[PDB]
Design a protein around this ligand. Structure first.
Ligand code: CLA
Ligand code: CLA
Ligand code: CLA
Ligand code: CLA
Ligand code: CLA
Ligand code: CLA
Ligand code: CLA
Ligand code: CLA
Ligand code: CLA
Ligand SMILES: CCCCCCCCCCCCCCCC(=O)OC[C@H](COP(=O)(O)OC[C@@H](O)CO)OC(=O)CCCCCCCCCCCCCCC
Lengths: 29, 84, 162, 742, 90, 40, 80, 153
């Protein structure tokens, strides 16, 4: 039910979004 | 010829085995002479090998005596002199 | 005598050398005719070509070496994996474009040829040009993955390795 | 003109410089102020080109040092022969080499150490030796202990001769610089004189002393009734019975009927089934052909008569459109720099030692060597280590030449200049190759480990899974197995039993050699080997190429060859000298050689070595577990390190108890090295500052002020202890395992 | 003979376009019009990043939620009776 | 003669002579009084 | 840019200046020492921080001191 | 006895260890002629083991439940031969060495270059100093009272 949806979100999608945001933050100015 | 020296070795197997045992036993006892009490302080002024032919130390003299036996005058490979 | 290796563009104090690998007419023509070096054309079409090549090439490894390679559904699963890789690559391209180029700034590409002749710098090194390039890359890559799947598992052509 | 050129009485023989430590250098001769001096004396002892700038003076010193080294080697050989003659069971091993273990060391009965005299058989107690001297002595025809005593005496006499020669040639007749630079004469004499005549003499000994005595031994006659070697020269009739061709004398040799000598000069291949080694008739013919080849080779260069070549002439004629002037200028470099010659010779010798190690196991030359597994493993590992160390020294001395003797204004060479003008391309390409090889070699092991741990054996890289077959090596093996029939028609068998000729040689119920199969696991280890070799090459070549300068340090040459750093500037400049690069490359050489010897040990114990019964069934030591277990790191950890260490850890209370003690000692020294490798001298000098206070409080502070070790010296100590501990761990583990189970 | 000009720093420092080609478009006009029409929505870099990240995450979650036991062993679940513990624990 | 005596007084030579004498003394004591765990 | 400072324990033997790899230091007139000259660091923006001057300092303690500070492209010795 | 240990003359594990050692030594005796030198060497080891175990019995050592001697250090008057007397002898030898070193370091301190007598040792001076350690406790005590032991800085 939930694990099949939550594990890809926490293990792949959230790290990707956080990495993209952090990279755009550190490359500013 | 090979099958003549095979005959020679057949007749002298026991004698050569007694040479092997003596020469290995002397080689081992060379490291144990002092503990045995054979070659030590007052008589080791020269080599225990030298004492072997003048004092008859137990194990280094059996090898000397057996070393050449049944061999000719100039055909013992373990002693240059043998029967000079 | 006759030496083959020469300093780059005749300048001995630029950190490069001219070798047959780098300066032969065949390789020079081949590199000049790749979509990555077509300066005077819309970057969107170049990105379309690049994506069409790369997404098409990416299908094979996923389909054949994947965990479900021995399943009857291996082709579709591998094509989906290749499409996901294309999506990730497009995300990386968009990230690089946003981080590297501001909207108003001009191009960072060189404005001189090897002969010193002034040219128009490549619009690919601008924000709009890079955005068009990555959009074309995404569209081409998805289409290439779909085309490889259609050729391999919809028409089932007698390819030796499938 | 080539002629003898000497100087008479150049250096006076006196004890006055023995009483003045550090006399050889200006700085050290003044005496010590701190403890650093004590180390500086030993580090600069043999750095002759730093003592004087005179090339002749340096050359005389190296010439005498070589004589000293030769004297030491002769002393070592004399000791080996004397211990074989006096403290060994060689004469008993001769009559039963399959059931008696060689031993030439007997310990004294003190503090309970007499347990090391184990039962090696033959009514003898001692320490089992793995040098292989017994098989070499049997091959040479040595039969009694008396002939070993005479060899020891002769080696002692020769050692005295070399020592006297060194003294005489440094103090009485010192050759001039022109004598050393006569490279054509030296090459001619070393090719024709040393090697050719040496091999010719050894061939004569083999056809006169070795072949007949070994024919008697292999026939099963007692060693004590074999005729003495000189008896095979005195009456030629004894030699005309084993080989009737000897009745013809030397007439066939001079009339060009050489096939008449086919009885004792053969081209067979394979191994002697009674012996398990190469046919002696093959070896004698090999040496006789090598003698002629080298005697003809040693006539290539021009010395005093018109005929011959000029080395400079050959060098200056090899140039092309890509290499400019070519090799012009190399003759001047190689005739004025000792370090370049040392570098080249070290590289070649280290490479040749590895080839020797590879060839001796696949073609056992000595009798009863193949079935003595402990000797084979020890010889292979020893020669691999020697080769690796010499190869590393080659890079070290190439870097030294680059730092000191390189001078484009007077000794320009186009090839070296062009190499230095694109070093970035070389180093970056080697970097990429190293990364690619590391991934595609080691990450396959990680993939296999993860698949096995996840319950997916069908997704691994294995022979029962996704295959990676070494097809090229398999094709080479098949080609070499078919050589006797099509490409080497005069040969009877292939050059080795490992090519695949579908035969196995068994001696004394033990497997000598058999066709070695290659599969996926071998494909993995070979690329692992290539990766480590490439990384070592990268580390050493980067140090050699960037020794003079880099973009970080434009003037790295003025800092010397061996300096710690250039300060914390530019982000940090630690270990930028060429010395550091050798210091780092020693670790990778150690890693590579350790993996190679582990591969050899596991493969031999799993697929070659074993036992054979009187039914035709072969049972290997580890039962062919290499193919399915050597493909995961867990396999190496469990089935090789854990399984085969069970011997050395249960050797206490036996004759092998000295190997467990050395096992623990090697572990301790290896751990000890990490204190030096992980720290720095600034902490230790401050710690010493407090101890000096405690000594001054009690008026026991020494005048020689205690100093922490220098930055470079700490690295040297750390790497030396690391290498010693690592190599000794494997020495003890291998010896215990292969003596207990072999 | 000289490679240092203060008026031309780009030439002096090697700011050249080595393999860049100024040739016109080698693509056909109709094909370029088709691609320009049907790839225009993906040329907004701000929109593309958000769309790719969010849609890819949603698609990944949906596909993981629609996987069957044939595709994933973890979805199939255990099929064998469980093993017992070392000293009778369950 | 004087110089050779000076050399024989250098640290390593004196050290090896001293430790050799010490090792010989300890070895002979252990040979004639072996296996000593206590002091009677 | 790193910080380079000079203290009046200077004896003016000019050892630091000729050990500078980037020409940061120079000698200026003075009256506090027999040599009538003291060191100065007017170009610390070219300082790399290799501390070669302190290795050439004869005074005890050092008369020239280098403090590693904010890093620039010049201070890290980068040519790319 | 002390700490639940039994004397090694009473404990059966000690005798069992002695029997097993002799049995292990006698198994290798079977592989040699009764008159050979290795047979004579293993017999000497057997006598050495017998003497060792008999001595350990006679000295009055305490053995644990494993048959091995255990040392008693707390200060018991019947166990001074295991730590106290050997410790006193060690402290006499080490103080001797330290005092001879200190006197030699003091004797060469007042010279032109005293670092040369630290790498090239003045052997006659060392011979003079060496035998002063036989009375090292008395001198070490006496420079404590006067104040020639500690440098007051
Ligand atoms: C928690 C972290 C996590 C998770 C959930 C997964 C999950 C997965 N990995 Mg994986 N992986 C991870 C971390 C993770 N990985 C890390 C850290 C490494 C490096 C060591 C790897 C290395 C790795 C390898 C080498 C492989 C996998 C594979 C797989 C898949 C195996 C299932 C299968 O057989 O179906 C197979 C199903 C397909 C091939 C079809 C997938 C189609 C997807 C669902 C399309 C959607 C993609 C989406 C649009 C992109 C979103 C990106 C995001 C940034 C927005 C599964 C999706 C295997 C695989 O086949 O995946 C490609 C495979 O070969 N992984
Ligand atoms: C892991 C590596 C790998 C794998 C498994 C595949 C697998 C495949 N590739 Mg492929 N490819 C790869 C790497 C790989 N590729 C690389 C690095 C390139 C260069 C960019 C290409 C370029 C490429 C092209 C251009 C084509 C393929 C095609 C194919 C398919 C048919 C191949 C065939 O039958 O040839 C058998 C012959 C030999 C193996 C020789 C197959 C699915 C073909 C395809 O998909 O057709 C529909 C096709 O046209 N590949
Ligand atoms: C590399 C060559 C080499 C090596 C490693 C060995 C090694 C060995 N030999 Mg050997 N040997 C060699 C060459 C070699 N030998 C040669 C060339 C000969 C022919 C001359 C011999 C002849 C020989 C004999 C005849 C014997 C050995 C023995 C031994 C073993 C014991 C040695 C020993 O305790 O020294 C003895 C100790 C010393 C020599 C003392 C070291 C001297 C140094 C300089 C320190 C001096 C300090 C001094 C001891 C203190 C007192 C000085 C005084 C002023 C107070 C040992 C395994 C013995 C053996 O195996 O017994 C079973 C034995 O009986 N060897
Ligand atoms: C046929 C003549 C001949 C032979 C046999 C040799 C042999 C050797 N030379 Mg040599 N050399 C020769 C001619 C020859 N040279 C000439 C003509 C020159 C001048 C161009 C040199 C210049 C030269 C140098 C500069 C060096 C050598 C070195 C060596 C040794 C290398 C180490 C080795 O392989 O150990 C093999 C060991 C043996 C074979 C043991 C036996 C020793 C041999 C028999 C002694 C050689 C005697 C010699 C040829 C003449 C003696 C003079 C006479 C008055 C007694 C080796 C002994 C190196 C060395 O180690 O120096 C000591 C070295 O540095 N040689
Ligand atoms: C350097 C190596 C070497 C040396 C020192 C010798 C030395 C000798 N060989 Mg000889 N030999 C050698 C290599 C060597 N050989 C090789 C490589 C072969 C194989 C081709 C032979 C084949 C051979 C035969 C077939 C015979 C000898 C014989 C002899 C002896 C007498 C030679 C003579 O005066 O008449 C010849 C000398 C000249 C014409 C000058 C002599 C002891 C003869 C002998 O008496 O046997 C015991 C004999 O019949 N040799
Ligand atoms: C025939 C080979 C050969 C020769 C002639 C030389 C000669 C030289 N080397 Mg060299 N080298 C060699 C091989 C060789 N090396 C190899 C194989 C390596 C790789 C490991 C090196 C690595 C190397 C470096 C890195 C350096 C030299 C240096 C030097 C020069 C100074 C040597 C000196 O004073 O040492 C004095 C000798 C010592 C301080 C003794 C060291 C003792 C070692 C570390 C212990 C070895 C462990 C031992 C085997 C185990 C004993 C156990 C213990 C318990 C007793 C000199 C010209 C140095 C230099 O400045 O060159 C100009 C330098 O920096 N070499
Ligand atoms: C086991 C420890 C270890 C490891 C793994 C490495 C690894 C490496 N060293 Mg090394 N090194 C070590 C110890 C180690 N070192 C020690 C102790 C020393 C001191 C002597 C050195 C000294 C040293 C020097 C002097 C040099 C190296 C070099 C290298 C590189 C060689 C290129 C290569 O193989 O890349 C391939 C990478 C690997 C094999 C690492 C493992 C990767 C596997 C496949 C897993 C990856 C999966 C995936 C990426 C995970 C992503 C998941 C995500 C969540 C992050 C590599 C990075 C050389 C270098 O930089 O050349 C390029 C070099 O010059 N090292
Ligand atoms: C700090 C650690 C330490 C200590 C306390 C000891 C203590 C001892 N060891 Mg030991 N040992 C050690 C480390 C240590 N060892 C290490 C590291 C090793 C490995 C090399 C060994 C290897 C070793 C062996 C192989 C043997 C010992 C033995 C002994 C005993 C010697 C008794 C003896 O000879 O008295 C007699 C000595 C004296 C009375 C000293 C006299 C000194 C001078 C001459 C006095 C004259 C002036 C007054 C003693 C209990 C021996 C023993 O019998 O054990 C039971 C024995 O055989 N040890
Ligand atoms: C004259 C010799 C001498 C004397 C009297 C002392 C005395 C002392 N040392 Mg010391 N030390 C010495 C030599 C000496 N040391 C040497 C040579 C070294 C270098 C290895 C050290 C290294 C050292 C350290 C690292 C430490 C001490 C400490 C100490 C103090 C506590 C005792 C201790 O830990 O001993 C232990 C002593 C040693 C480990 C070294 C002993 C070395 C030998 C036995 C001395 C030989 C002297 C000489 C060769 C003989 C002279 C011959 C002459 C007649 C010709 C104490 C004041 C400790 C301290 O400050 O705490 C208060 C401490 O941490 N020492
Ligand atoms: C690879 C092609 C190849 O090896 O060609 C070999 C090529 C031949 O050079 P030349 O014929 O100009 O050299 C003539 C003399 O130097 C030969 O002694 O060497 C080079 O071009 C330099 C680069 C070698 C290293 C390349 C990597």
């Amino acid at each position: 039910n939930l694990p099949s949806i939550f594990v890809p979100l926490v293990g792949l999608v959230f790290p990707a979004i956080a990495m993209a945001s952090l990279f755009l933050h550190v490359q500013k100015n | 010829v090979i099958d003549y020296y095979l005959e020679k070795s057949k007749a002298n197997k026991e004698l050569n085995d007694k040479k092997r045992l003596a020469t290995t036993d002397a080689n081992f006892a060379r490291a144990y002479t002092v503990e045995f009490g054979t070659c030590k302080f007052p008589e080791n002024f020269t080599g225990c090998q030298d004492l072997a032919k003048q004092k008859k130390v137990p194990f280094l003299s059996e090898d000397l005596d057996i070393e050449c036996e049944g061999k000719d005058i100039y055909k013992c490979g373990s002693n240059v002199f043998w029967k000079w | 005598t006759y030496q083959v290796i020469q300093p780059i563009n005749g300048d001995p104090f630029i950190g490069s050398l001219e070798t047959p690998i780098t300066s032969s007419p065949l390789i020079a023509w081949y590199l000049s005719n790749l979509p990555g070096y077509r300066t005077a054309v819309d970057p969107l079409l170049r990105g379309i070509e690049v994506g069409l090549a790369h997404g098409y090439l990416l299908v094979g490894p996923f389909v054949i070496t994947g965990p479900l390679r021995n399943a009857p559904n291996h082709g579709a699963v591998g094509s989906l994996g290749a499409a996901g890789l294309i999506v990730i690559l497009s995300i990386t391209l968009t990230m690089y474009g946003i981080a590297s180029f501001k909207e108003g700034d001009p191009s960072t590409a060189p404005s001189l040829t090897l002969t010193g002749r002034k040219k128009v710098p490549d619009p690919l090194q601008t924000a709009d040009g890079w955005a068009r390039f990555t959009g074309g890359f995404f569209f081409g890559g998805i289409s290439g993955v779909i085309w490889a799947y259609f050729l391999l598992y919809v028409l089932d052509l007698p390819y030796f390795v499938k | 003109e080539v002629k003898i050129l000497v100087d008479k009485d150049p250096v006076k023989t006196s004890f006055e410089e023995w009483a003045k430590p550090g006399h050889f250098s200006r700085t050290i001769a003044k005496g010590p102020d701190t403890t650093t001096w004590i180390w500086n004396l030993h580090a600069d002892a043999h750095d002759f080109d730093s003592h004087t700038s005179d090339l002749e003076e340096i050359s005389r010193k190296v010439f005498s040092a070589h004589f000293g080294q030769l004297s030491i080697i002769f002393l070592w050989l004399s000791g080996m022969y004397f211990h074989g003659a006096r403290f060994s069971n060689y004469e008993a091993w001769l009559s039963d080499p399959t059931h008696i273990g060689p031993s030439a060391q007997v310990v004294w009965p003190i503090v309970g150490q007499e347990i090391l005299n184990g039962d090696v058989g033959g009514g003898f107690r001692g320490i089992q030796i793995t040098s292989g001297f017994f098989q070499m002595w049997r091959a040479s025809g040595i039969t009694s202990e008396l002939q070993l005593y005479c060899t020891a005496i002769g080696a002692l006499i020769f050692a005295a001769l070399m020592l006297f020669a060194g003294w005489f040639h440094y103090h009485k007749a010192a050759p001039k610089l022109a004598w050393f630079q006569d490279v054509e004469s030296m090459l001619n004499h070393h090719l024709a004189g040393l090697l050719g005549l040496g091999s010719l003499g050894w061939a004569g000994h083999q056809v006169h002393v070795s072949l007949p005595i070994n024919q008697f031994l292999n026939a099963g006659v007692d060693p004590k009734e074999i005729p003495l070697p000189h008896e095979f020269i005195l009456n030629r009739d004894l030699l005309s019975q084993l080989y009737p061709s000897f009745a013809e004398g030397a007439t066939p040799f001079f009339t060009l009927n050489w096939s008449k000598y086919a009885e004792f000069l053969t081209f067979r291949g394979g191994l002697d089934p009674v012996t398990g080694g190469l046919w002696l008739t093959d070896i004698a013919h090999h040496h006789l052909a090598i003698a002629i080849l080298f005697l003809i080779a040693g006539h290539m260069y021009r010395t005093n008569w018109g005929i011959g070549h000029g080395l400079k002439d050959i060098l200056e004629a090899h140039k092309g459109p890509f290499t400019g002037q070519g090799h012009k200028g190399l003759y001047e470099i190689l005739t004025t720099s000792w370090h370049a010659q040392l570098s080249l010779n070290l590289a070649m010798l280290g490479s040749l030692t590895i080839v020797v190690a590879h060839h001796m196991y696949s073609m056992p030359p000595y009798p009863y060597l193949a079935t003595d597994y402990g000797t084979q493993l020890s010889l292979f590992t020893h020669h691999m280590w020697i080769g690796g160390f010499l190869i590393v020294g080659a890079a070290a001395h190439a870097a030294i030449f680059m730092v000191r003797d390189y001078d484009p204004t007077t000794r320009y060479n186009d090839l070296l200049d062009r190499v230095l003008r694109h070093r970035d391309a070389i180093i970056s390409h080697l970097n990429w190759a190293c990364i690619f090889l590391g991934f595609h070699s080691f990450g396959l092991y990680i993939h296999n480990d993860t698949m096995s741990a996840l319950g997916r054996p069908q997704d691994m890289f294995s022979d029962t899974a996704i295959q990676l077959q070494p097809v090229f090596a398999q094709w080479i093996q098949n080609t070499h197995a078919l050589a006797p029939g099509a490409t080497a028609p005069s040969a009877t068998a292939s050059t080795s039993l490992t090519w695949g000729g579908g035969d196995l040689v068994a001696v004394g119920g033990k497997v000598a050699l058999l066709p070695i199969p290659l599969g996926t696991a071998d494909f993995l280890v070979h690329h692992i080997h290539a990766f480590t070799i490439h990384v070592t090459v990268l580390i050493l070549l980067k140090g050699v190429l960037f020794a003079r300068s880099s973009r970080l340090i434009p003037d790295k040459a003025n800092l010397g060859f061996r300096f710690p750093c250039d300060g914390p500037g530019r982000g940090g400049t630690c270990q930028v000298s060429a010395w550091d690069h050798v210091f780092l490359g020693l670790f990778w050489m150690y890693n590579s050689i350790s993996v190679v010897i582990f591969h050899f040990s596991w493969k031999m114990q799993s697929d070659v070595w074993g036992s054979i019964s009187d039914q035709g069934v072969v049972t290997h030591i580890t039962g062919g577990n290499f193919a399915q277990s050597s493909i995961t790191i867990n396999g190496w950890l469990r089935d090789f390190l854990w399984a085969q260490a069970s011997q050395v850890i249960q050797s206490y209370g036996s004759s092998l108890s000295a190997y467990g003690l050395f096992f623990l000692g090697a572990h301790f020294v290896w751990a000890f090295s990490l204190m030096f490798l992980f720290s720095g001298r600034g902490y230790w000098q401050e710690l010493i500052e407090s101890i000096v206070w405690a000594h001054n409080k009690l008026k026991v502070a020494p005048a020689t002020q205690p100093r922490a070790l220098s930055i470079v010296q700490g690295r040297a100590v750390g790497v030396t202890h690391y290498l010693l501990g690592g190599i000794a761990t494997t020495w003890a583990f291998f010896l215990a395992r292969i003596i207990a189970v072999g | 003979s000289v490679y240092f000009d203060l008026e031309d720093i780009a030439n002096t420092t090697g700011q050249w376009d080595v393999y860049g080609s100024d040739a016109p478009s080698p693509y056909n006009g109709l094909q370029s019009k088709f691609f320009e029409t049907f790839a225009a929505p993906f040329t907004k870099r701000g929109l593309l990043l958000k769309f790719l990240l969010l849609g890819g995450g949603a698609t990944l979650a949906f596909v993981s939620s629609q996987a069957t036991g044939d595709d994933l062993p973890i979805v199939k679940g255990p099929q064998l009776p469980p093993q017992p513990g070392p000293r009778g624990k369950i | 003669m004087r110089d050779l005596k000076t050399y024989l007084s250098v640290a390593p030579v004196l050290s090896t002579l001293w430790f050799g004498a010490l090792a010989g003394l300890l070895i002979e004591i252990n040979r004639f009084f072996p296996d000593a765990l206590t002091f009677p | 840019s790193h910080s380079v400072k000079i203290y009046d324990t200077c004896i003016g033997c000019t050892q630091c200046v000729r050990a500078c790899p980037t020409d940061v230091l120079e000698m200026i007139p003075w009256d506090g020492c027999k040599a009538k000259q003291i060191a100065s660091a007017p170009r610390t923006e070219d300082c790399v921080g290799c501390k070669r001057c302190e290795s050439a300092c004869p005074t005890d303690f050092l008369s020239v001191r280098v403090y590693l500070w904010h890093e620039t492209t010049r201070s890290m010795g980068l040519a790319y | 006895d002390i700490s639940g240990l039994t004397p090694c003359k009473d404990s059966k594990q000690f005798a069992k260890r002695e029997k097993q050692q002799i049995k292990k030594l006698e198994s290798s005796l079977k592989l040699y002629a009764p008159e050979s030198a290795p047979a004579l060497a293993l017999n000497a080891q057997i006598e050495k083991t017998k003497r060792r175990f008999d001595n350990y019995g006679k000295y009055g050592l305490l053995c644990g439940s494993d048959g091995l001697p255990h040392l008693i250090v707390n200060g018991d008057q019947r166990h001074w031969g295991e730590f106290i007397t050997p410790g006193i002898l060690f402290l006499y030898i080490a103080g001797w060495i330290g005092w001879v070193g200190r006197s030699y370091l003091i004797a060469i301190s007042g010279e032109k270059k005293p670092a040369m007598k630290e790498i090239i040792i003045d052997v006659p001076l060392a011979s003079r100093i060496i035998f002063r350690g036989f009375i090292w406790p008395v001198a070490a005590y006496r420079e404590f009272l006067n104040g020639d032991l500690i440098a007051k800085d």
